[PDB]
Every structure is written in C-alpha cells, then in structure tokens.
Amino acid sequence: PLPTSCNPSDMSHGYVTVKPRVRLHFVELGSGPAVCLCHGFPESWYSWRYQIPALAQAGYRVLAMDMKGYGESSAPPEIEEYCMEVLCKEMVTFLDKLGLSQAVFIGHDWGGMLVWYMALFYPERVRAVASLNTPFIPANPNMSPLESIKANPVFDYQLYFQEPGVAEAELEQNLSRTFKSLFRASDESVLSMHKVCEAGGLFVNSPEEPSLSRMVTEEEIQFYVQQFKKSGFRGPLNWYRNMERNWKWACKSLGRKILIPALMVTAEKDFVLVPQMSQHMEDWIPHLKRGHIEDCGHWTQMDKPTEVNQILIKWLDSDAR
C-alpha cells in the first residue's frame, strides 16, 4: 500500500525572495516543528510526495523546497551561484524571511550534501539534520577534488557534467526519455555510468524508448517533464561544477564536529552513494543515529516510501520533537 501522495494543485505554494534575482518556491503542509525537505539532482519538491502527507500527519510543519535551479525557483545561469556557500547562506535567509529560528533539515543526494553543510556551518539554525544516501566526509585539505573524483570510477559521470552545455544538450533532447531512463529501480537500470566520458554521454547506450519503471507512473514522469521545461538542466548541473570552491569552503570548518542530532540513512542498492561511504561518520558527528533500507536504490523516497517514512518519523519523534 503506497502512502498518500500529493496533488500539486491541492498544495499551498510559497515564495520567498532571498535576494533581488533569487526567489525560492516551496510547498507547505501541516503544523508543528518546521521540517525543510531538500531534494537532489535532477529532482523536484515532488520527489517528496510520499513523505509530505505522512510527516504532516505525524505532527510536523513540512516545507518541501524547489532547490535553486529547479521548478518554480529562480535558475540564474552563473556556475558560482550554485556553490554550497551561496546555497547555504540563501537557506539561512529563507528561514529569516519566514521568521523561523530553526528548522529540521532533511536532504537526499545533493540536497543531503547541502543539509550537512547547513549543520556544519549554521548549527544554531538547524534543529536536527538527516541525510538519505549522501554521507558526510570531511574535506582533505591535502587532496584536490579532481584527484578524489578521478580516484573513484563510479564518479566518472561527474567529469562528464563539468563542461557547460554538453550534458545539458543530452538531457534536454528528450525530457521524457531523460526521466524514464534515470528514475528506475536498481535492477531496472539502463545506465552503466562507467567511462561515460569515454562513451560520449549518459544515454548513448540506453534505449531510445525506455519502458516505465515499476516505481513511477506516466503522469508522474510528465510532471517532471513540465517542470524542466521552465529552466532546463544548466542550473541543476551547476551543482556539480563547484568542486574546488566547495572544498575550499569545507576546509575552513576543519576541526569542528557536528554536535546537533543527526540521522544517516543508507540505501543498499545505491551503487554511487554506497553505504560503506558513511563508515566512521560517528568520528565527526557524536550524536549520529542510523537507518538502512534494503532493496533500495538511489531514488530512495519513491523506491521505499513506507520505509523512509517510518525511519524519519521515529527519528523526528525521538530526536527533533
């Protein structure tokens, strides 16, 4: 039995201008402690559609964002607008304009990376932090990001995403094909993500007309299509084009721990953000709690929504509320 989902037209839609050219969109449901959900690449507030009702029914005020570059949020073209320092400071201003002293931050993928840096640099604004799939790895001030990325074969696609315009052209060519190719269970994968640079793209060796994953409906895919017609993939991809800047900012933390309540949820079949990558996070995050979802790939919220909801609500009730 799938959890209750969300109908976009039935939600409260909010807009906050954090700077003159940057307006952030979100949907809001529920009363209680504020919980801010932060999606990853290339997703939407709607990626949380199975969490938003559940969390509101559990007694939380849910704010599910369109991250900068996505949906109804602003999408400036400049790469540096999407570095973690800029993105984190904009989320602080977002809370300020909403009049929220703090919020729980829950992220997945790139949104998971942003919530860890929020917890690291703005703990006084973060009541508790949870990440789906994305670990918290301290920066190594004697290793370049180029070297780290190049040291792990599963991170090749990240090199492919570097040159502005290249991956955009591939991902924008046929939006249905893009989303139907990406949003698949681990056993339904049509992507190898091996030597994608070498092969000349993500989809060069994937079907022209992919089948629909068991995880999603045609209507759901078409919601994503419509959202990415607004701004396309430049802003989204720009999240990946700040590796050096993000490393330099992360190095300024160095020393400190994250002392707030924290939850790391691993996904057994995410073959990029692998569970093992989270090992020893407790060395830097003394109050860390864990969850683990079996039979679950990269798209955690729609792969195993019931399990996600159970994990988050149990943790929120014990550690955030």
Author numbering: 227 to 547
Paper excerpt:
Soluble epoxide hydrolase (sEH) is a ubiquitously expressed bifunctional enzyme encoded by the gene EPHX2. The protein harbors two distinct catalytic domains connected by a proline-rich linker. The bifunctional soluble epoxide hydrolase (sEH) represents a promising target for inflammation-related diseases. Proteolysis targeting chimeras (PROTACs) are heterobifunctional molecules that induce the ubiquitinylation and subsequent proteasomal degradation of a protein of interest (POI) by bringing the POI into close proximity with an E3 ligase, such as cereblon (CRBN) or the Von-Hippel-Lindau E3 ligase.
We rationalized that replacing the cyclopropane ring and attaching a linker to the sulfonamide moiety of 3 would lead to a short branch addressing sEH-H ligand, whereas functionalization at the indole-N would result in a long branch sEH-H ligand. Based on these results, we modified 3 at both attachment points with a C3-alkyl linker bearing a terminal alkyne group and obtained short branch addressing ligand 4 and long branch addressing ligand 5. For the set of PROTACs harboring PEG linkers, we used commercially available azide-functionalized pomalidomide derivatives (20a–20f) with linker lengths varying from PEG1 to PEG6. Both sEH-H ligands 4 and 5 were treated with 20a–20f under standard CuAAC conditions to obtain the corresponding PROTACs 21a–21f and 22a–22f. To validate the postulated binding modes of short branch vs long branch addressing PROTACs, the two PEG2 exhibiting PROTACs 21b and 22b were cocrystallized with human sEH-H. As predicted, 21b addressed the exit of the short branch of the binding pocket, while 22b addresses the exit of the long branch. Right: 21b and 22b interact with asparagine 335 from the catalytic triad and tyrosine 446 and tyrosine 383. The PEG2-linkers and CRBN ligands were not resolved. All of the compounds exhibited low nanomolar potencies toward human sEH-H (hsEH-H), confirming that the attached linkers were tolerated in the active site of hsEH-H. For the murine isoform, potencies were typically less potent by 1 to 2 orders of magnitude using the short branch exit vector 18a–e and 21a–f, yet still showed strong activity. None of the PROTACs harboring an alkyne linker (18a–e and 19a–e) decreased luminescence compared to DMSO-treated cells at any concentration or incubation time. The same was observed for long branch addressing compounds with PEG1-PEG6 (22a–22f) as well as short branch addressing compounds with PEG1-PEG4 linkers (21a–21d).
